[PDB]
């Protein structure tokens, strides 16, 4: 009843952003909406004038620094399926180092954000990638459990047919996992990106 | 799993109780959107106002207090510490299923799990102050 605010020009053109001045690093200013209203408080009714600036986060930094390291860690974990089952220390090194790399990535990913008490899309992606890496380690554990003898193929002897010195057979678990794990990870990536991008 | 009741106290700096007396109104402490605030790690349970008299060297002063009850939220810390520690413990359990003749593999697995625990302990304390008791 005492002071009322109005926009000088029409509301859309009453707020102007200089084209040269833009100090956003990880955001894109899509536009601005301009409006006015009232606020009711104990002291009385006050005119409020509002401008909502619409911002969209830029994904490139996080793609470079979180998603690609996680994807490469998953691929590195899945690489171990192509080694012979008798390379126990080597495959254990693969599994353990990939698990720790995923753990470190999970720890470092949340440092960017404020300490919010809910899971984000990046958190879900990291969780799925950790699940893949840990499942690969379990796969190696199963292969080692079913391994019989502790020496690999000599190089010259002729593996007779399962149907002298015997030798371990190539693991059916490894043969299946070699195609199963990359296919499932690719399907997960497809569904995840299709879910979260066009939103 | 901690909960706190943080105070906000005010009073007259100069004038003792015989000169200025404060009093709460009928509906004195009002709030708008409680859970649209900047409380990320905490949730606002409620508030309560009180009044008392505090004796100082200058005199007795009417002190007016508002306590805000805050309850911590488990999500961030569950992501950060609990899940990785349990996962590393399970990674340690994986050693039991490896052949005992795999000496370097099992030894590296165990010692590496103990390393990742030292590191997880070290980083779990970062958010807290340097208190001298176990949480």
């Amino acid at each position, epitope marked *: 009843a005492e002071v009322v605010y109005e926009w000088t020009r029409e509301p859309a053109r009453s707020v102007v952003v200089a084209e040269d001045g833009s100090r956003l690093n990880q955001y894109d200013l899509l536009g601005q909406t301009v409006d006015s209203g009232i606020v009711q408080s104990s002291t009385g009714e006050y005119v*409020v004038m509002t401008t909502h600036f619409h911002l969209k986060r830029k994904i490139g930094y996080f793609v470079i620094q979180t998603y690609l390291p996680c994807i490469m860690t998953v691929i590195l974990s899945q690489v171990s399926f192509w080694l012979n089952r008798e390379s126990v220390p080597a495959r254990t090194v693969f599994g353990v180092t990939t698990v720790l790399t995923m753990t470190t990535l999970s720890i470092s990913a949340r440092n960017s954000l404020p300490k919010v008490a809910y899971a984000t899309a990046m958190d879900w992606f990291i969780a799925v990638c950790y699940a893949f890496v840990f499942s690969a380690l379990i796969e190696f554990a199963t292969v080692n459990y079913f391994t019989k003898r502790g020496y690999a193929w000599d190089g010259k002897s002729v593996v007779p047919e399962k149907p002298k010195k015997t030798f371990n057979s190539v693991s059916k678990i490894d043969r299946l996992s070699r195609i199963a794990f990359p296919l499932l990870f690719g399907i997960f990536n497809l569904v995840y990106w299709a879910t979260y991008l066009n939103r | 799993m901690d909960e706190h009741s943080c105070p906000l106290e005010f009073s007259s700096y100069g004038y003792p109780r015989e000169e200025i007396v404060y009093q709460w109104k009928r509906s004195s402490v009002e709030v708008g959107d409680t859970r649209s605030w900047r409380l990320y790690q905490f949730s606002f349970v409620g508030l309560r106002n009180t009044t008392e008299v505090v004796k100082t060297t200058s005199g007795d002063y009417v002190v007016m207090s508002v306590y805000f009850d805050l309850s911590r939220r488990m999500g961030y810390f569950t992501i950060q510490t609990y899940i990785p520690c349990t996962l590393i413990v399970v990674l340690s359990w994986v050693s039991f299923w490896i052949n005992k003749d795999a000496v370097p593999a099992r030894t590296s697995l165990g010692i590496t799990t103990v390393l990742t625990m030292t590191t997880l302990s070290t980083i779990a304390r970062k958010s807290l102050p340097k208190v001298s008791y176990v949480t």
Partner: nanobody, 108 residues
Framework: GSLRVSCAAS????????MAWFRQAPGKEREFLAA???????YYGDSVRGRFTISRDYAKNSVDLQLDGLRPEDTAVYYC?????????????????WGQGTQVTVSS
């Protein structure tokens, strides 16, 4: 005539979302009547400025609309909406949650 339309939200905390009221008579596009923000700031359409009033109870997670000066041109279906106002706060597209809707009729 006077009337009151309430809209209570369950399953999600709509306190931190802008909550709005819309109207849609048959053969009409959903039009914005009112809205209220997290900061207790109220917006009204030009057709309904000064007649209808919007309020919110954040503890109960509800938005109420008191309709005054009802007229037979006002008969329509009234929708409750809530969401984050992105490119909107006056357009139905920006609200990601909607109610069933309630019919209102005035007879002279």
């Amino acid at each position: 005539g006077s009337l009151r339309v309430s809209c209570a939200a369950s399953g999600r905390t709509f306190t931190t979302y802008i909550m709005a009221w819309f109207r849609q008579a048959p053969g009409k596009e959903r039009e914005f009547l009112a809205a209220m923000d997290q900061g207790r700031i109220q917006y009204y359409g030009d057709s309904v400025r000064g007649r209808f009033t919007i309020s919110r109870d954040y503890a109960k997670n509800s938005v109420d609309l008191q309709l005054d000066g009802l007229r037979p041109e006002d008969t329509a279906v009234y929708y409750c909406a809530a969401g984050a106002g992105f490119w909107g706060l006056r357009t139905a597209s920006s609200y990601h949650y909607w109610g069933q809707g309630t019919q209102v009729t005035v007879s002279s």
